[PDB]
Amino acid sequence: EMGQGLHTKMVQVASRALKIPTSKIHISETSTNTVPNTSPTAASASADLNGQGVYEACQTILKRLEPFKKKKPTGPWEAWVMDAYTSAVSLSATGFYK
Amino acid sequence: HPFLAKYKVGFMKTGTVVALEVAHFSNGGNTEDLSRSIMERALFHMDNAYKIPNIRGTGRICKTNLPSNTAFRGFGGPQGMLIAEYWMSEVAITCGLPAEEVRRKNMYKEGDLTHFNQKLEGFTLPRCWDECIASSQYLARKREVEKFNRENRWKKRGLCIIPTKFGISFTLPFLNQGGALVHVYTDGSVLLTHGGTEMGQGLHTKMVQVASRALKIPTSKIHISETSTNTVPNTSPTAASASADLNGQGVYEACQTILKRLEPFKKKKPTGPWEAWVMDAYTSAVSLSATGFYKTPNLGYSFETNSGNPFHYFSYGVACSEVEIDCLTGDHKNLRTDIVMDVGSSLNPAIDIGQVEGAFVQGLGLFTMEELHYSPEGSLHTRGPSTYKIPAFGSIPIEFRVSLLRDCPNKRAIYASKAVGEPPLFLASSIFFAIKDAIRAARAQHGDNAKQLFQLDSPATPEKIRNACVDQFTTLCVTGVPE
Amino acid sequence: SATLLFQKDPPANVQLFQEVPKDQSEEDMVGRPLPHLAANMQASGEAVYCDDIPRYENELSLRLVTSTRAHAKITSIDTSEAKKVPGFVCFLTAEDVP
Amino acid sequence: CDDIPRYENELSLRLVTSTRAHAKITSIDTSEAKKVPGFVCFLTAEDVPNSNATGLFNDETVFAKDEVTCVGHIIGAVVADTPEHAQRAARGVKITYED
Amino acid sequence: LPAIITIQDAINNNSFYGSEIKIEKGDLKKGFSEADNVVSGELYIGGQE
Amino acid sequence: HFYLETNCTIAVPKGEAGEMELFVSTQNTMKTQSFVAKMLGVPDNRIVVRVKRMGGGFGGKETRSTVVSTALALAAHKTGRPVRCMLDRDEDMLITGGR
Amino acid sequence: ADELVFFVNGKKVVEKNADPETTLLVYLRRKLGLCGTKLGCGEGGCGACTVMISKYDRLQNKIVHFSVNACLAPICSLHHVAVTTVEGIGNTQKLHPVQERIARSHGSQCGFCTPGIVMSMYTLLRNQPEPTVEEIENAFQGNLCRCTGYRPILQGFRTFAKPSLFNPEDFKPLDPTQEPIFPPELLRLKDTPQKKLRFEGERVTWIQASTMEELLDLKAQHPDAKLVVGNTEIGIEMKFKNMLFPLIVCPAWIPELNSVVHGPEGISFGASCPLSLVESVLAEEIAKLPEQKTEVFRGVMEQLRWFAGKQVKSVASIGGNIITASPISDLNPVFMASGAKLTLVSRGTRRTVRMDHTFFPGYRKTLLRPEEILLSIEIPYSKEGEFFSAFKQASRREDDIAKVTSGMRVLFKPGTIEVQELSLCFGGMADRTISALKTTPKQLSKSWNEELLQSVCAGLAEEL
Ligand SMILES: Cc1cc2nc3c(=O)[nH]c(=O)nc-3n(C[C@H](O)[C@H](O)[C@H](O)COP(=O)(O)OP(=O)(O)OC[C@H]3O[C@@H](n4cnc5c(N)ncnc54)[C@H](O)[C@@H]3O)c2cc1C
Ligand SMILES: NC(=O)C1=CN([C@@H]2O[C@H](COP(=O)(O)OP(=O)(O)OC[C@H]3O[C@@H](n4cnc5c(N)ncnc54)[C@H](O)[C@@H]3O)[C@@H](O)[C@H]2O)C=CC1
Ligand code: FES
Ligand code: FES
Numbered sequence A: 001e002m003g004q005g006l007h008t009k010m011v012q013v014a015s016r017a018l019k020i021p022t023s024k025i026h027i028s029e030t031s032t033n034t035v036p037n038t039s040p041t042a043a044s045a046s047a048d049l050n051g052q053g054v055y056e057a058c059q060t061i062l063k064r065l066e067p068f069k070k071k072k073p074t075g076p077w078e079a080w081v082m083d084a085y086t087s088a089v090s091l092s093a094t095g096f097y098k
Numbered sequence B: 001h002p003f004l005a006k007y008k009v010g011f012m013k014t015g016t017v018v019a020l021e022v023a024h025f026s027n028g029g030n031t032e033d034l035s036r037s038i039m040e041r042a043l044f045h046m047d048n049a050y051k052i053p054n055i056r057g058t059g060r061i062c063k064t065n066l067p068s069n070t071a072f073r074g075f076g077g078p079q080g081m082l083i084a085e086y087w088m089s090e091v092a093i094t095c096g097l098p099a100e101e102v103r104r105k106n107m108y109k110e111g112d113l114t115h116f117n118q119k120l121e122g123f124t125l126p127r128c129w130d131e132c133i134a135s136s137q138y139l140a141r142k143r144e145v146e147k148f149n150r151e152n153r154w155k156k157r158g159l160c161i162i163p164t165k166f167g168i169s170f171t172l173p174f175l176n177q178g179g180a181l182v183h184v185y186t187d188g189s190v191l192l193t194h195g196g197t198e199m200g201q202g203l204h205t206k207m208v209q210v211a212s213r214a215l216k217i218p219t220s221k222i223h224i225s226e227t228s229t230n231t232v233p234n235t236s237p238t239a240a241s242a243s244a245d246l247n248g249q250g251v252y253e254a255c256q257t258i259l260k261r262l263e264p265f266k267k268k269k270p271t272g273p274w275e276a277w278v279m280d281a282y283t284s285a286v287s288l289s290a291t292g293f294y295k296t297p298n299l300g301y302s303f304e305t306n307s308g309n310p311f312h313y314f315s316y317g318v319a320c321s322e323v324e325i326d327c328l329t330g331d332h333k334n335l336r337t338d339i340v341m342d343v344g345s346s347l348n349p350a351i352d353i354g355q356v357e358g359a360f361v362q363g364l365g366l367f368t369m370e371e372l373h374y375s376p377e378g379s380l381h382t383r384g385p386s387t388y389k390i391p392a393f394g395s396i397p398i399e400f401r402v403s404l405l406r407d408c409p410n411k412r413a414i415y416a417s418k419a420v421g422e423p424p425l426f427l428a429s430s431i432f433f434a435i436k437d438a439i440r441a442a443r444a445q446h447g448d449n450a451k452q453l454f455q456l457d458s459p460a461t462p463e464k465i466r467n468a469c470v471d472q473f474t475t476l477c478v479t480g481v482p483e
Numbered sequence C: 001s002a003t004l005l006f007q008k009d010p011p012a013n014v015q016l017f018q019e020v021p022k023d024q025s026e027e028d029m030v031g032r033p034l035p036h037l038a039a040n041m042q043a044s045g046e047a048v049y050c051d052d053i054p055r056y057e058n059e060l061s062l063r064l065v066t067s068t069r070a071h072a073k074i075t076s077i078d079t080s081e082a083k084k085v086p087g088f089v090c091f092l093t094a095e096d097v098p
Numbered sequence D: 001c002d003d004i005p006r007y008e009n010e011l012s013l014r015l016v017t018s019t020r021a022h023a024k025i026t027s028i029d030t031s032e033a034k035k036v037p038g039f040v041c042f043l044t045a046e047d048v049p050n051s052n053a054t055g056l057f058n059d060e061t062v063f064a065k066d067e068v069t070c071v072g073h074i075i076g077a078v079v080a081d082t083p084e085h086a087q088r089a090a091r092g093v094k095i096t097y098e099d
Numbered sequence E: 001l002p003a004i005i006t007i008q009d010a011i012n013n014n015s016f017y018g019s020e021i022k023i024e025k026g027d028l029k030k031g032f033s034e035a036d037n038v039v040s041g042e043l044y045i046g047g048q049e
Numbered sequence F: 001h002f003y004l005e006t007n008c009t010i011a012v013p014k015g016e017a018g019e020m021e022l023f024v025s026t027q028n029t030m031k032t033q034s035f036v037a038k039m040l041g042v043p044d045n046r047i048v049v050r051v052k053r054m055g056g057g058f059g060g061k062e063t064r065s066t067v068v069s070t071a072l073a074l075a076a077h078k079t080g081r082p083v084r085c086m087l088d089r090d091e092d093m094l095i096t097g098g099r
Numbered sequence G: 001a002d003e004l005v006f007f008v009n010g011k012k013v014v015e016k017n018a019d020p021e022t023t024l025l026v027y028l029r030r031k032l033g034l035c036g037t038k039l040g041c042g043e044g045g046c047g048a049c050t051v052m053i054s055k056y057d058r059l060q061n062k063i064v065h066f067s068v069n070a071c072l073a074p075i076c077s078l079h080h081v082a083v084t085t086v087e088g089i090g091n092t093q094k095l096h097p098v099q100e101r102i103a104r105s106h107g108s109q110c111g112f113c114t115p116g117i118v119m120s121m122y123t124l125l126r127n128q129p130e131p132t133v134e135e136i137e138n139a140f141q142g143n144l145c146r147c148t149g150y151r152p153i154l155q156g157f158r159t160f161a162k163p164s165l166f167n168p169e170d171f172k173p174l175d176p177t178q179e180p181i182f183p184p185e186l187l188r189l190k191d192t193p194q195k196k197l198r199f200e201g202e203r204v205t206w207i208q209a210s211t212m213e214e215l216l217d218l219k220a221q222h223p224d225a226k227l228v229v230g231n232t233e234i235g236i237e238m239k240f241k242n243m244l245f246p247l248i249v250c251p252a253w254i255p256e257l258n259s260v261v262h263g264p265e266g267i268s269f270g271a272s273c274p275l276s277l278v279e280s281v282l283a284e285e286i287a288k289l290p291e292q293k294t295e296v297f298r299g300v301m302e303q304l305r306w307f308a309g310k311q312v313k314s315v316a317s318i319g320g321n322i323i324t325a326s327p328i329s330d331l332n333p334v335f336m337a338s339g340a341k342l343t344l345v346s347r348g349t350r351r352t353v354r355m356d357h358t359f360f361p362g363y364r365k366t367l368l369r370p371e372e373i374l375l376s377i378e379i380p381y382s383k384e385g386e387f388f389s390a391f392k393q394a395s396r397r398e399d400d401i402a403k404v405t406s407g408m409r410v411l412f413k414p415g416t417i418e419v420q421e422l423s424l425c426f427g428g429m430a431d432r433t434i435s436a437l438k439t440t441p442k443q444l445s446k447s448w449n450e451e452l453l454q455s456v457c458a459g460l461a462e463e464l
């Protein structure tokens, strides 16, 4: 983030991808030990590249929650997440795009 | 948790036990915390190594105005098992049969069900037992103990061999899960993290060894820096001896993902080095970051139907210990301990032997040295090393022998290993029962009957040892009489 | 033996374990007695534990205040003497929990 | 970045740069730098543990060695207790050039 | 206020965390009746820091 | 570029295994990490670069930020103490180049 | 003056505003940033804070080296000494043999106790480059480890004395000539005579006395001035019993309080002599004199085997134990049973007392007047037909508080087994050290036989 509102856009993307309000999603910082081998934030490309990466990480999560969403079709987001955790389903995912 | 137990055991003249009823009470303190799960594990281990056809254990956790008691290496197990070993000692004494024979004949066989109905498969305990009996020269040393005791009125020796079975897995099934995150930077160096925390048990060392095997690169190329909630979320505590099992699998899966991504570059350059494959994958825009996850399958016990497996597998081990007590002061020396431990195919025998010895010495403290004192109004008096006496350099057995069982791979855990953290702690009860044997030798010298079942609470401190060695001095002090 | 001054024989230790298979790679360390990775730094006092982390210039210190009674009502709390101590910042209680 | 609180043991650095567009460095004199209270050290190419070659195409120095190739070429860095002491010490680093 | 300190204080006051936990298998009445010997006792095990 | 926040790095050495954490106003964490690691002679897995936000970059912090980061990482390694440098505007305009 | 000057790892530290409440541990960690030295208990029991002190001993014209608990060492006590921490002996770029061997032998698990154990072993080697296995174990009486079970530490260090988990053949050899130089400055500074120092903190003033006259004058005008030598009681009272003594005087530099004098009746030790000095002189005397002469000496030595460990005995004074007057002092029963002679001084007075029941009139009280100090204690030679035993039983053998501790002496009429004198003294049986004075007089002129045993036992059962 250098003022171009990249984190704002990524939260907007993730919120649509996960179908949850932006208020439930937070980006704190950028670090080499969370995402490695990153291109510079440059070439106006960062929302395109990171947006796709964010979208894909979110799709992995949604795919893991689907059996719990299917069982409790209206039960809130928080119910599916606690159900996934107590069923020992991973709630962490990487995403990537080229 | 302090435990109080009320037991009743029925047995044959052969020493075969046929009925066991035990009520347990624990002192939980002023919040629930882990107390009920601790009581569950004690109940799971009230059999120790013994098949008992008619059995009833109950547990109650007391709510008290004391600081809240919690998890401690063993987690109710050592308390449940010492009770088992205590009535078992009384069964042998009552029958007039050697303790080691009575224990052996009551031991489970391969394929037996426990009192909670889990099948004992890959039951290596009889092997640990026979190897320890043999390497400790137990029967020859029994004779030398007997001879020392004939030649010495005011010092007595005692010798005891004790087995153990310890169930591996959190008693709350969903906690048996683990996560990892791995990065490969473009110089080919690997940054690894997992949910486990380093507290001296060498977990990061084992995970680096695991990752190095999984990736087929030297350990020198792999680094773990720290544990953080923002690299691996929703982690179970580093507890239940489970962490290398759980995180090892997670680490392994993250590494497999990386290898699968590198395989076409490995195919293009079959001999070209790791660094070439990694740079090739990077400049072909292939992801060099992966999560890994694992959950232990098929777990879940029900107390209502007494069915379902609480544990993934069991750890087994046996310890033989010899002591020499000073009947006039209550002091004793730990002369020799032999331990044979099934750690599966050890991930790191240096770390695993370190864990056996460390765990054993904490149990030695639990059963013989470490005592907490409270005012009648519930204020802890014991608040530092001056009054709380943990084992010192001089407290350890003079001959200290540890063997890891050979040829016993455990397929269902990472690279055929077994967890090692907690299981050996209880084996220090061999010192407690060696002391009880020494005390019995001292009591017989005062004419006080064999087959007499005198009281020895835990810990067996100098106070408890000295008071139990009844003689002309104790008699004079207590009642005012002797000769 | 009642009159003997305390004395032990010298220690005699034996550690037995299994060698890894003969054709296991020397770079494959699983089952080998690799020393704890931090052992050298621990021996040298270079390993960092929580309190070894340097303090920030603006860092503050906390001390817990605990009950001296097993079971009692708290009828009052007086912090007047506390407030006189140089460097005193605040006393936190249940009221302060957000 | 600079809003982050300083550690109690934190030091300040000041870069020392070339005042010539193309010249040989013939000597560096830090006599005056060393007189500034709080002075710790002056880092040069000699202090680099591994490689002094940097930049996207590996054609740049971390610190100038033997020659400077622009006005602004980083020759070294003063380390001091405070930014004020670092600036004063960096002024006392005297460089001699041959154009 | 009235304090409950020891295990026996708690038993006397019915001060417990939840209900009794129990595992039972087989036939105790028959087990005890057909045994050659019966031995009963109590054991106390201190805590640990 | 005249980003309102000039180039800035804090390097925090961790005293174990060559581990270092850098807090940097940079558009390029990867090259910051690589250039620091290569200068120090440690693997990339020892160096962590963190960026919360920059007060502007506009391309000027895509590579040129590293001339501050490396000098600072070196001072931190040498001293075993955290070290910080924020460039003055005159320093930044001179050293870091432009379009 | 008022500047505090010492060395840490060979580097001069000048502290212009030394607070008497500052310990060495806090100073190393928070002022110098040297965090290798750990806090594990703050009460002398764990050894995690063990460091080495070197100083020039003006009495002996020699450099001495000893370990101490940094958690209990006031920095105001350390003027003109050299401190060595784990950082001073080596690092991962060049490990000291002590460091390398504990690491490679798997003697370091969590690693928090490791620097303190390293420093205890290091200190032993500076004093004895080739120790016995017994000396090695004795070095660690004041070090605790919760992880390793001790075995690998002792086994790795055994290589310094006189498939496998590690290879002792790959260990780098020890070259004692390569240890850090004793700071030349401190050798130059010992040429200048020591003067009184005053340190003023937020709550406490510390006076480092240089002469007896200074000390006695201070005690005369301010009898409330609290003497501190090793700080192994006072440090505990301040930190744990919330005691504050606004005026402290440290008499440790004073020659008369540090002297060892061999006399006709025994050996007198200055009251500030550390327990480690008492141990070293009595050991020499036990080795060279006839057994007949050394019964009381061997009684003291038996007690000192089980008295704390090296770090505490390096700074703990003999007079500090006597004056603290704890009911469970391990030495007072022995001094009482032997009737050791104490010299008491104030400004304008000097008197002698043989320690007996009257020396301890109440709980933690002695017969000393507020302005008096203990100057010396004479530990006596035993006579022909005089025998002595000392006993201690605690909860643990090593570094523990006695439940009962005892000194016992018998003198026999010459050539006989008939009792001339009998003294049985006990700690841990009352609010002070006591003598069994109802039981023992009944035994005089009795023969040492079963009837005497039974009479003493019945007497003790009633009296105690
Ligand atoms: C870890 C540890 C283990 C211990 N183990 C034992 C043990 O096994 N047995 C045992 O008996 N004690 C033990 N102690 C207690 C203590 O170490 C001894 O009592 C020690 O000798 C006190 O000496 P000091 O110089 O440190 O006294 P300080 O703390 O400096 O002073 C103690 C008291 O003596 C007074 N004093 C000192 N010198 C004089 C003087 N010459 N004239 C008049 N008053 C004086 C002081 O004013 C103060 O009241 C232990 C303490 C610790 C911390
Ligand atoms: N820190 C350590 O590891 C060690 C410390 N020391 C000594 O232990 C002392 C502990 O101090 P405190 O807790 O204040 O203990 P204290 O000095 O008050 O002594 C307590 C002991 O005195 C006896 N006692 C006291 N009053 C009695 C009475 N009325 N009747 C019968 N017996 C009575 C009992 O034996 C009791 O255990 C320290 O000051 C130190 O001198 C000794 C060994 C080890
Ligand atoms: S910290 Fe435990 S002895 Fe100093
Ligand atoms: S290794 Fe952890 S206490 Fe010694």
Ligand SMILES: [Ca+2]
Residues within 6 Å of the ligand: B028, B029, B030, B031, B032, B033, B034, B035, B068, B069, B070
């Ligand atoms: Ca609890």
